[PDB]
Design a protein around this ligand. Sequence first.
Ligand SMILES: [Cl-]
Ligand SMILES: [Cl-]
Ligand SMILES: [Mn+2]
Ligand code: NA
Ligand code: NA
Length: 325
Amino acid sequence: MPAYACQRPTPLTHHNTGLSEALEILAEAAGFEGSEGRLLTFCRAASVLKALPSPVTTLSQLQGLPHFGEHSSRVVQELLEHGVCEEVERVRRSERYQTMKLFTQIFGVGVKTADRWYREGLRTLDDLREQPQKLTQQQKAGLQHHQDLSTPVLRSDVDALQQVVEEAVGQALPGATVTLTGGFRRGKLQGHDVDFLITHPKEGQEAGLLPRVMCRLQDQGLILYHQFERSFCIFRLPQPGSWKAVRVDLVVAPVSQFPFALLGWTGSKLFQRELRRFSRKEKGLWLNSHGLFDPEQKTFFQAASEEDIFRHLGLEYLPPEQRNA
DNA sequence: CGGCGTACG
DNA sequence: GCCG
Ligand SMILES: [Cl-]
Ligand SMILES: [Cl-]
Ligand SMILES: [Mn+2]
Ligand code: NA
Ligand code: NA
């Protein structure tokens, strides 16, 4: 079992679901307290279990697994022995965890904002609605739409959204393409949002594209909220006899960068962090969603495919469905 | 012990 | 919290 998540296939569904979910609670709680190192270890330990070929049934099976030390092993031991880990359950029922989760789930609210509100004594969404002087326009939209945004986006919703995005993109720039990215490209059947990557086969033609796309979606009445090359929108999605609000991310990249943007926007989030960590620490190359830089030669690697990028990093290729770290 | 992804709005 |  290799130490980096980008070195091993991680399927969407696996054989250690309960154990990984427990460790991810502790990771999330660590993030709410600003403990980013402990968040990473618990995330990585959870991800290792996702990559295993069968269920962990005994503590000895953790021997030699990366990112399992005293703490993560004790969590697993307690779950194996009793079906519950007291620390995890303590976190789950705690007022701090529940409120930080509630608040950071709001579009426009991060950990720092949630924490300040928590310290001011705020606890519920209606507490926030009762003091709207303290909210940004983005937060106001996130609160207004919070119920709809809490409802899973389904794969059926995705195909409808892609068609309307392609229509606007085609008028904004004939020949431009729309690619589904994010969790749905990794095979997820539900999500929190839908992610699209837009490019054009003629380098440079994509410049200035996203404003033109957004203007056209707005004129079709499809945009409930928007604020360039990245857009974090709330879309009006038709429903039987009604509609619902859905978060949609639109991203534009030049075709020269498209493999890097596709890789970067297909995730998972942990997979990308691990991939960039691997690139820099093990290969001495700097990776982002625009390119891959050799800081000795001061040159950028040209990639024509995700396969190219995995090869340039010395990694076996993983299809999107195996990047569910 | 230092390090822990890396961008854009 | 864990790795190197
Ligand atoms: Cl930490
Ligand atoms: Cl980036
Ligand atoms: Mn998204
Ligand atoms: Na948020
Ligand atoms: Na997504």
